[PDB]
């Protein structure tokens, strides 16, 4: 054996130039695509915002046109989903996470268009759903689609191009090169066996992806919290406690996100119509709150800066938290296309700010600034729910640029994964796959 | 498949006991790594104090500079060739092998030899990192607790060993992330599955990084402030720089191995001729650490200065070449100490240089040499060691200029690409593929 190794070692890191080139095209496409998707979700959330003003006089008329306009989008979304591609529904990550394990199919001739358009509708509607899902999936199906076209064989080209397209997608959705790579090699990839994935080919993809993102949406960040304070050594324990909170809570949320999935399934019983209806119903509830209380609805970003700056009273926070927990479950558990990643970023930010405000009181001698805890807990749910901290932390760090909080950011995120494990928690993305897999090897 | 469904539902559940030892391996590697760091100081200082003590007589100094350092280097190589021949060299391949079970973790030896043998080599002022000494001491600490409290299973043996490996590289660069990333990208078994608790590692690294802080906080290792940004139309300049490090990286890899052979002749394996050639090279440094501080030393002190652009283009090429030499000698002459850090210094200099030529040819890009410095700082770590994702997150943590990330990647990537197509090989892997085929005859 110590013979073969010696041979392999001398042969390490030598991915076929051909794979290293397609990675360059999967990325360029996922990027151009992810951008086009992003631009679309804009034009829509806007055309809507434009019509509320167009009739700004008549109040009830608005609450209606807000609900209607969004309901009509959500519906068109769920339709395309239940009609042509039931995988497009939900997050869209587990489907790719499964596909890497060869346990799921990558029907791109369907998913690409369904996930895309079905997404604009769900996002343009203003629902509480991320973008990762839509682009991480579209990401992969792009990989597979080039893998097939130019045709390429071997478990590598099939795992590689699929994994690079998965990452390049999560990159252009958060403008976070690193976080992309890190997500693949920590969550997406086969968790229990070896797998021939060119980590170098991935980079090439992510980069080519991130450049396209920049070429069109540069000179403006997604989140701006400026340079908050630093974390004195004697204030680190406060981040371990916060980490515990997200730790016990993370799983509880994981239960609700699954339970609601069952429960909500009743209502339409699988009926393409009752579903598409309950769709427009929830998609409308959002197009309305996206007005009466912008915080409760929407993707989640707009409010992160404001929550971190400390512009919400403690009361207003608890509300927004709870209101969100609800709106996020509905939209995601109701099998609508769109990630659940980002909305969890918003939930931690709010639960963090809150913890922050209580801290800033009990400890005047620590000269705290609520903001630190916001940024500490921002990827804490990504850690207690999805149970993939190393990615959560490098994601936040890339969007908030406050590297001096890294120690607290880790202690929080870590403590979270620790308290989530000891309380029966499970990787929310893995469970969803273990259930979509089970159910299949159930209906036999 | 059905099993997968079962496993999935069981993912990420590392035994509370492992998750606790990780906490102790880290605390120890940290306290240790700090103690080592403090020692290498007291020495480089006691020396600097004696040069002044006789500041009048010039030749006397050049001598006492050479002597004082020669006497340290020797005491270093001795402890090495005498009680633990693995302590010699970097010290990473040995742990990288140990994870593959292909090498032994003789801690009852390595800990004390690597440690004291290091203070001697570093205190001497030679061109060698600290990663090696602490990455190794790191692992041997893991194994040492693994044995003491006694723990079985391939996991606890791979985990605690891998956490102590990372916790070490963390307290050596105060870079929590880079640590974790190094394990799960280079140190870990590159061609088969391996039960390593990534969560247990974190706990280690953190506990390690806190100890580092507790003693050396309020002061960074590298301060380059906030340099400019990289306009989209200036990205290609980083691909070209990436190509340079790409063709060069392997060439350096050859010299680092060849010099290892060649230098071996001179002492022929003779514990004495070796220990002598040791103090010889260790003296050459204690002297340059005076006549030309840049050529000698660990490498940090000069990174800020090279980045700020305080060296003329001439002075750079010199320092580059002078270094390439001094770095090969000290590392190829099997002395204890990493080669990681010194490569950080080499990229910084080759970057600044590329930077200055750029700042000329393109006045319309409003460049600032510094950006290229910070871009190429982890470029060697990418063309030589061929582990970019770690190089990049390491620089990013020490330089804190996240707005350069895109250029940092394009450079580092292009490097690994140009190194591959030119037959390059993971310098850490090659050294093991030798350590292994040697133990096979």
């Amino acid at each position: 054996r110590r013979r073969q190794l010696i041979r392999q070692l001398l042969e390490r890191d030598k991915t076929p130039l051909a794979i290293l080139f397609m990675a360059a095209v999967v990325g360029t496409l996922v990027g151009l695509a992810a951008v086009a998707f992003d631009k679309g979700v804009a034009w829509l959330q806007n055309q809507r915002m434009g019509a509320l003003v167009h009739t700004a006089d008549n109040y009830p008329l608005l609450l209606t046109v807000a609900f209607l306009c969004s309901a009509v989008l959500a519906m068109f979304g769920y339709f395309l989903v239940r009609k042509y591609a039931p995988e497009a529904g939900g997050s869209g990550i587990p489907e790719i996470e499964g596909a890497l394990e060869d346990q799921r199919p990558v029907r791109w001739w369907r998913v690409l268009p369904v996930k895309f358009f079905g997404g604009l509708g769900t996002l343009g509607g203003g629902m509480v759903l991320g973008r990762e899902g839509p682009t991480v999936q579209i990401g992969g199906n792009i990989g597979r689609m080039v893998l097939d076209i130019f045709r390429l064989k071997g478990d590598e080209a099939r795992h590689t191009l699929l994994a690079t397209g998965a990452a390049a997608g999560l990159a252009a959705a958060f403008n976070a090169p690193l976080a992309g790579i890190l997500f693949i090699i920590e969550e997406m990839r086969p968790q229990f066996r070896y797998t021939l994935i060119s980590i170098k080919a991935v980079f090439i993809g992510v980069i080519m992806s991130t450049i396209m993102y920049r070429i069109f949406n540069h000179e403006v960040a997604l989140i701006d919290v400026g340079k908050l304070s630093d974390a004195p050594l004697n204030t680190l324990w406060l981040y371990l406690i916060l980490g515990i909170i997200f730790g016990i809570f993370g799983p509880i949320f994981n239960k609700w996100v699954l339970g609601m999935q069952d429960l909500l399934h009743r209502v339409h019983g699988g009926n393409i119509t009752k579903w598409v209806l309950m769709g427009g119903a929830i998609g409308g509830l959002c197009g309305l709150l996206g007005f009466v209380a912008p915080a409760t609805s929407g993707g989640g970003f707009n409010l992160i800066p404001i929550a971190t700056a400390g512009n919400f009273s403690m009361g207003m926070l608890v509300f927004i938290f709870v209101a969100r927990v609800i709106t996020t479950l509905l939209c995601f558990s109701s099998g609508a296309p769109g990630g659940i990643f980002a909305p969890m970023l918003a939930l931690g930010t709010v639960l963090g700010t809150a913890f922050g405000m209580v801290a800033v009181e009990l400890f005047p001698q620590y000269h705290l600034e609520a903001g630190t805890f916001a940024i500490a807990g921002m990827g804490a749910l990504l850690a207690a729910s999805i149970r993939a901290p190393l990615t959560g932390i490098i994601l936040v760090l890339e969007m908030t640029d406050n590297y001096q909080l890294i120690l607290p950011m880790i202690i929080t995120g870590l403590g979270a994964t620790l308290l989530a494990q000891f309380t029966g928690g499970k990787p929310l993305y893995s469970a969803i796959l273990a259930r979509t897999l089970a159910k299949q090897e159930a209906e036999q | 498949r059905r099993q997968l469904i079962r496993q999935l539902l069981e993912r990420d559940k590392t035994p509370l006991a492992i998750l606790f030892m990780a906490a102790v391996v880290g605390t120890l590697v940290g306290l240790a790594a700090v103690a080592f760091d403090k020692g290498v100081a007291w020495l480089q200082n006691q020396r600097m104090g004696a040069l002044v003590h006789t500041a009048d007589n010039y030749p006397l100094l050049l001598t006492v500079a050479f002597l004082c350092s020669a006497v340290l280097a020797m005491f270093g190589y001795f402890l090495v060739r005498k009680y633990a021949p693995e302590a010699g060299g970097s010290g990473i391949p040995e742990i990288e092998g140990a994870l593959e079970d292909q090498r032994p973790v003789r801690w009852w030896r390595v800990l004390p030899v690597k440690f004291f043998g290091g203070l001697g080599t570093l205190g001497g002022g030679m061109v060698l990192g600290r990663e090696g000494p602490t990455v190794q001491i790191g692992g041997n600490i893991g194994r040492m607790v693994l044995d003491i409290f006694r723990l079985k299973g391939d996991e606890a043996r791979h985990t605690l060993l891998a956490t102590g490996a990372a916790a070490g590289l963390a307290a050596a660069f105060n870079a929590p992330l880079a640590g974790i990333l190094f394990i799960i990208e280079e140190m870990r078994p590159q061609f088969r599955y391996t039960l390593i608790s990534i969560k247990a590692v974190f706990i280690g690294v953190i506990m390690s990084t806190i100890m580092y802080r507790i003693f050396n906080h309020e002061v960074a290792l590298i301060d380059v402030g906030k340099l400019s940004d990289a306009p989209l139309n200036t990205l290609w300049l980083y691909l070209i720089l990436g190509i340079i490090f790409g063709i060069f990286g392997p060439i350096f890899n050859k010299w680092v191995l060849g010099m290892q052979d060649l230098l071996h002749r001179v002492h022929g394996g003779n514990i004495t001729k070796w220990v002598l050639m040791g103090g010889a090279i260790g003296g050459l440094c204690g002297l340059l650490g005076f006549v030309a501080p840049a050529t000698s030393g660990g490498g940090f002190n000069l990174i800020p200065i090279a980045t700020a652009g305080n060296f003329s283009m001439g002075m750079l090429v010199f320092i580059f070449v002078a270094r390439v030499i001094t770095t090969l000698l000290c590392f190829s002459s099997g002395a204890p100490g990493g080669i990681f850090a010194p490569m950080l210094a080499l990229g910084t200099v080759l970057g600044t240089a590329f930077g200055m030529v750029a700042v000329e040819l393109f006045p319309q890009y409003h460049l600032e040499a510094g950006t290229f410095a910070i871009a190429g700082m982890g470029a060697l770590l990418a063309a030589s060691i061929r582990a970019p994702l770690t190089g990049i997150i390491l620089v990013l943590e020490m330089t804190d200029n996240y707005q350069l990330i895109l250029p940092m990647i394009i450079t580092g990537l292009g490097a690994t690409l140009l190194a591959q197509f030119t037959g390059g090989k993971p310098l850490y892997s090659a050294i093991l593929a030798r350590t292994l085929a040697k133990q096979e005859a």
């Epitope: 340079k227 304070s229 004195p232 050594l233 004697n234 204030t235 001698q365 000269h367 600034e369 | -």
Partner: antibody, heavy 120, light 107 residues
Framework: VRLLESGGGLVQPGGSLKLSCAAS????????MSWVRQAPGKGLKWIGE????????NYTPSLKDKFIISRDNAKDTLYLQISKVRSEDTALYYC??????????????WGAGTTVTVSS | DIVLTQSPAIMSAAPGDKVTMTCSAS?????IHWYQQKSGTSPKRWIY???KLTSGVPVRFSGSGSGTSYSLTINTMEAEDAATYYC?????????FGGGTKLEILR
Amino acid sequence: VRLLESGGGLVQPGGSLKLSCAASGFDYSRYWMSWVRQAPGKGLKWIGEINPVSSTINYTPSLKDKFIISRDNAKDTLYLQISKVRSEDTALYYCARLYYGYGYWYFDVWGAGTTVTVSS
Amino acid sequence: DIVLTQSPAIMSAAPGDKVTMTCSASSSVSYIHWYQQKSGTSPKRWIYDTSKLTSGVPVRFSGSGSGTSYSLTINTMEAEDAATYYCQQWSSHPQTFGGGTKLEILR
């Protein structure tokens, strides 16, 4: 890094003055500024303090508005407003920068200190 | 608001001579700090975090303690040590200072 304080002088019991501290030598933001005073022939007693962004100001136990502290991050100046002055306000006032090691804040750098005499 | 009580209100020592002074709290405190104050001039941060000396402070100094009693020491105190030392604490809001100790020179 220098910390200049000016504005102290003579005042009538009952009146009010505005002390000023000009900061040179360090990025005045990111810091916490605080005032400490010393009655001739007595120890040091802390008056109050303020952070960067100016969204937090704490004072020692005093009346509803006995003291008003503020800072213009723009002019690199720290002010102190004392009102309804008794003669217990007759003291030497110092401004200071605030920092820490572990996290138990100390008074980093002080200033010469201007004098306030409260008399009729 | 804790109440730190400096020890010898006043006290003189000879040049080259070990000196100690106390700062007994009225409750737990942690990593108290010490300040030096020369007639007519602004306070200086000497010892900080119970023992950690300040960048530039003369090595003859050392300070320690815990819980409720802390102390400053001059291992052979010279003249440029003749001043007034104040201990401060900020382990619990609001911060507080001691009565101060008058280190006068004996000759």
